[PDB]
């Protein structure tokens, strides 16, 4: 038990050790180890299985009932200032650790068969193991300096994961835009860390909390400076994750392989921006104005993503904007005071979002088997039709995911969504009704995606484009089916979506007594009933609009021209965001030169 907790530090080291072993030999020979594709992946799979078993053992020991462990040591000491680094063991840390390890293991199990036609196979597994090791290091980190260290590591490895094929020109600018988008939040977190070390200097979180409490009690500073420092702290997860000012990096980072976005969107870059505010909750509980502006910008970006993701012809961009909308929900709930409910909503959202991205990647791979190497004719929705009879279990899994993201009967996201709406209705009625309309607006385009992707008649390609399927892949005429590789995680990730709905009920409320903040109501039922009513409204609108077809959207597009054309591109966001900034920077650098 106690040696098991003393030796609980090599778990993020062994995937890093495997990545070092792979990368030391991949650049030394690059012709001998290039033939070895399968056992070099089997070794990484065995290391990830050992890490998953260690994570399950630590989570079982934490749920059995113990004390939160800590281990710190001196790192770059000085005469007066001493910096301590190490690892903390928390039940929330193990709860995120099992999620990260299970998601990485299922992504590697998908990429075992997804990359069976690409010559680059060993660098993909090495970079995925490096991403998993950096995320496992980011989970267990009690000091904010190593939070910044693993933040930079996640940003660098995501910059490596975006540019993989180095053939397309969109992914060239996408990684360079995403790195400076992360650099804006890194600048904000650096200013926040500088201000926090200027005021405080006790490196613990609770020590910083009660030191700031004693510095607020005995009058030494102004609360406006603490508000500016809290805004600078929040500015990190604004630009790293998706928010109102900085969210245009995510459709650029969408372009690439599907196991890349399956790790980026699930619990690694999405969960880290929430976990930074989760570790800074006693600092943020002192003043409420930063909590109100956090909830306001979360409700604003949730309202923005729902109106963007309607008229989108790409499946992965609409999935990413729905992820932005759910980020708005969980950020607004964390600003209100739905902390444990926001963490449970993040867990549920990652649980169905990884499965939904794997199903979308299976549909994309089937359309790659049908339609050739043109990506714009492959990710479009005008060609999707009649995919239910060819993909029965994949279509059923996508239906389960698209129904659990709504949850008009009692399901996984149902209780978490009603707890979020109850917290906002306790906070503010206007944001509650805004999120109530947003919850129907997201179900509208969700069921639009479900009724345009699988159900309907089979639609072919017009003869203006090329019609061949022998460019650089296999030869197949009918839409085929993945035999055993891609079908396994789609049925593994089904039973958590059933289990966490009954395990996270508000009656027993085990998640509240398991994860707590460090320090029966009928109105809940009628807000839940209003959510079911607007979900049924969204279902009955999006059903016959695309299956029956009597409210045809062409007459609706001819009806409202400017409201459609303003949100058609994205929302007229990027053409104002990049243009004058890049031109001003170019003119300033030209004048300086």
């Amino acid at each position: 038990m106690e040696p098991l907790y003393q030796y609980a530090w090599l778990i993020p080291v062994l995937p890093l050790l495997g990545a070092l072993i792979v990368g030391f030999g991949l650049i030394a020979f690059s012709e001998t180890t290039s033939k070895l594709r399968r056992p070099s992946a089997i070794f990484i799979m065995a290391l990830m299985a050992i890490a998953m078993g260690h994570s399950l053992t630590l989570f079982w020991s934490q749920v059995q009932g113990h004390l939160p462990y800590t281990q710190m040591i001196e790192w770059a000491a000085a005469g007066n200032l001493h910096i301590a680094m190490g690892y903390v063991i928390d039940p929330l840390a193990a709860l995120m650790l099992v999620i990260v390890t299970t998601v990485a293991f299922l992504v590697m199990l998908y990429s075992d068969g997804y990359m069976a036609h690409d010559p680059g196979y060993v660098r993909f597994f090495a970079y995925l193991s490096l991403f998993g090791s950096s995320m496992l290091g980011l989970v267990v980190s009690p000091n904010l300096v190593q939070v910044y260290i693993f933040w930079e590591l996640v940003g660098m490895c995501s910059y490596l994961l975006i540019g993989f094929w180095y053939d397309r020109k969109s992914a060239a600018e996408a990684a360079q835009k995403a790195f400076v988008t992360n650099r804006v939040g890194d600048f904000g977190l650096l200013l926040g860390m500088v201000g926090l070390f200027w005021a405080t200097g006790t490196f613990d979180f609770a020590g910083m909390g009660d030191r700031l409490t004693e510095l607020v009690n005995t009058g030494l500073l102004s609360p406006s400076l603490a508000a500016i420092l809290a805004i600078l702290v929040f500015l990190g997860p604004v630009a790293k994750s998706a928010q109102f000012p900085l969210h245009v990096w995510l459709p650029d980072a969408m372009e690439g392989p599907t196991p890349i976005s399956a790790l980026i969107h699930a619990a690694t870059m999405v969960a880290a921006g929430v976990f930074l505010i989760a570790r800074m909750f006693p600092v943020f509980e002192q003043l409420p104005q930063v909590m109100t502006t956090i909830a306001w910008t979360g409700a604003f970006t949730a309202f923005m993503g729902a109106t963007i993701a309607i008229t989108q012809n790409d499946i992965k961009k609409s999935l990413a904007y729905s992820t932005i909308s759910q980020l708005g929900y969980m950020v607004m709930g964390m600003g209100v005071g739905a902390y444990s409910a926001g963490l449970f909503h993040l867990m549920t959202h990652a649980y169905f979002k990884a499965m939904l991205f794997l199903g979308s990647g299976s549909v994309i791979h089937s359309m790659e088997g049908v339609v050739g190497h043109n990506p714009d004719l492959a990710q479009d929705m005008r060609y999707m039709g009649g995919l239910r009879k060819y993909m029965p279990i994949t279509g059923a899994t996508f239906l389960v995911g698209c129904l659990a993201i709504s949850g008009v009967p009692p399901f996984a996201g149902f209780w978490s969504k009603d707890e979020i709406l109850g917290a906002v209705f306790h906070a503010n009625p206007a944001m509650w009704l805004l999120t109530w309309l947003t919850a129907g607006l997201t179900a509208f385009y969700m069921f639009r995606m479900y009724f345009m992707t699988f159900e309907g008649k089979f639609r072919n390609v017009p003869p203006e484009r090329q019609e061949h399927h022998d460019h650089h892949s296999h030869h197949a005429a009918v839409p085929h089916e993945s035999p055993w590789t891609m079908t396994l995680p789609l049925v593994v990730l089904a039973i958590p979506s059933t289990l966490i709905g009954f395990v996270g009920t508000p009656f027993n409320n085990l998640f509240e007594v398991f994860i707590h903040a460090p320090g029966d109501l009928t109105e809940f039922l009628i807000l839940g009933g209003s959510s079911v009513g607007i979900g049924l409204m969204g279902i009955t609108v999006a059903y016959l609009m695309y299956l029956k077809g009597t409210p045809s959207p062409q007459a609706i597009a001819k009806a409202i021209q400017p409201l459609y054309q303003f949100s058609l591109h994205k929302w007229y966001f990027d053409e104002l965001y990049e243009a004058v900034f890049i031109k001003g920077c170019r003119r300033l650098a030209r004048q300086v030169l």
């Binding site: 650049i27 770059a76 020109k169 600048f187 650098a589 030169l593």
Partner: protein
């Protein structure tokens, strides 16, 4: 302990360079010359390591190896050598960088004799600068490096190198103009005319005389170390060069001007150092800002990396005047990290210059479709250069920020303004290094670039040099306590004296 070590380490390349014009008949290109020079550099680095690991202690804060030799009964030229705390890793960096630069100079055909002779002559002076503990012999060793690097950049470089070489030698002469005056001014005040270093720090001067001496020091140290009014020589110096001379140009030669900038202007006189500390901090901030904004609009491949030397030495210019123990201790680590990054990056630039003759970022569109080790090494060196925490650049700038955050006499406006400006400086500094990697490799395959020139994938020899240059940066960035204990007592004594002199 009774044997002279540093004197023989300095004098051994100067003696061994006399065998370079001898050279029994190779009947070839000059391969015995480089095979002898590599062995000479290897045994010199082995002697440096063997002298460091035995006699250098970490307890005495003064000088461990103290050897004095009476040269003449005249003026005061005295061969007195001494190793300090913050100068002991500098010699081990000098020997390592010069050994790998000797090993990296394989394709030399046009006059290798004078090349390796000037290399072995500059390797003696690069240790004689850091090992001397005099006032006049230090100026002699500073003017010793005047001729050989100028001669190498004259006999080979890019285009119009004759305009750059004369400007470089006249800039170095203008740098050396003030050193003799500023050394004789502090020595001719009162009595004790002898030029011992330990007696010059105990002398007392007036306020205006110390201000004039500090101005004469800062003019030469602003000519040497590049600041925004005196950095016009550096694009012409570091853009028009080849790789094995550019390694020594961008490594220890830039830290030579920063080591003396600490050792004279803090230990000799700290009273006038505090009056120019906000000016030096603001000049380093403007340096960090101006280097990225100048290098982003540049189209040349080598000046784009040469301005990164200014962008990285601005952090040292900030951290020198921080008046903190951690801020003073992080400057040596930042200098070592910047040298180890810039030498590898400029050797890599000089290596990829031979595969693609055009030095334009527009035609370079499809160089990554054939060779992948070159692209992987460039991505690894760039990511080591920008902000990464596994390498010690982030640890060095974190030490600078932490040492500048807890300072004195700059309470309300100055710390937050300088921190907010250095934050947008580190916003601006990865932009051009990202855009270069986006424009050169990431793109379609150019047909004319393959039709005109044919590129060949890299050797396993080229992997070995970058593998030897990358591992000490990761070893320092993973465990920064290895370099701390070397000069912790010296930096503590320096900061204690600087806080004893500074009132309030």
């Amino acid at each position: 302990s009774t044997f002279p070590w540093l004197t023989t380490i300095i004098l051994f390349p100067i003696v061994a360079a006399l065998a370079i014009p001898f050279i029994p008949d190779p009947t070839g290109k000059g391969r015995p010359i480089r095979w002898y020079a590599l062995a000479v550099g290897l045994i010199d680095f082995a002697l440096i390591v063997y002298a460091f690991t035995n006699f250098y202690d970490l307890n005495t804060p003064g000088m461990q190896l103290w050897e004095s030799y009476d040269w003449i009964p005249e003026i005061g030229l005295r061969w007195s050598v001494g190793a300090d705390g913050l100068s002991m890793p500098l010699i081990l960096l000098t020997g390592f960088i010069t050994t790998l630069a000797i090993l990296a100079a394989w394709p030399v055909t046009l006059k290798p004799r004078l090349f390796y002779f000037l290399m072995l002559a500059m390797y003696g002076g690069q240790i004689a600068v850091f090992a001397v503990q005099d006032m006049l012999v230090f100026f002699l060793a500073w003017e010793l490096e005047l001729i050989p690097v100028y001669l190498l950049l004259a006999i080979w470089g890019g285009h119009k190198r004759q305009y750059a070489a004369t400007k470089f030698i006249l800039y170095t002469a203008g740098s050396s103009l003030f050193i003799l005056v500023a050394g004789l001014a502090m020595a001719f005040y009162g009595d004790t005319v002898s030029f011992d270093m330990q007696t010059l720090a105990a002398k007392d001067y007036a306020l205006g005389f110390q201000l004039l001496v500090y101005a004469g020091f800062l003019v030469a140290y602003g000519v040497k170390l590049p600041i925004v009014p005196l950095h016009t020589w550096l694009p012409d110096a570091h853009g028009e060069a080849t790789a094995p001379v550019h390694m020594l140009l961008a490594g220890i030669l830039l830290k030579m001007g920063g080591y003396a900038l600490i050792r004279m202007n803090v230990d000799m006189l700290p009273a006038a150092h505090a009056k120019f500390a906000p000016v030096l901090v603001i000049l380093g901030v403007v340096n960090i800002i101006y280097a990225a904004l100048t290098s982003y609009a540049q189209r040349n491949l080598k000046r784009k990396i040469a301005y990164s030397s200014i962008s990285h030495i601005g952090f040292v210019l900030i951290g020198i005047a921080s008046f903190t123990n951690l801020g003073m201790s992080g400057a040596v680590l930042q200098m070592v990290s910047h040298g180890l990054i810039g030498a590898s990056l400029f050797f890599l630039v000089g290596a990829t210059y031979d595969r693609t003759h055009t030095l334009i970022l527009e035609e370079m569109g499809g160089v990554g479709q054939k060779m992948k080790k070159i692209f992987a090494m460039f991505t690894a060196c760039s990511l080591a250069s920008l902000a990464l925490p596994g390498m010690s650049g982030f640890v060095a700038e974190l030490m600078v920020f932490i040492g500048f955050a807890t300072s004195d006499a700059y309470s309300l406006p100055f710390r937050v303004i300088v921190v907010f400006l250095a934050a947008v400086g580190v916003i601006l500094t990865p932009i051009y290094l990202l855009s270069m990697l986006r424009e050169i490799f990431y793109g379609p395959e150019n047909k004319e670039l393959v039709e005109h020139e044919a590129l060949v994938d890299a050797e396993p020899r080229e992997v070995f040099i970058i593998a030897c240059l990358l591992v000490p940066i990761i070893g320092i960035g993973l465990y920064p306590k290895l370099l701390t204990q070397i000069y912790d007592a010296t930096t503590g004594q320096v900061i204690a004296r600087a806080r004893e002199v500074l009132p309030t």
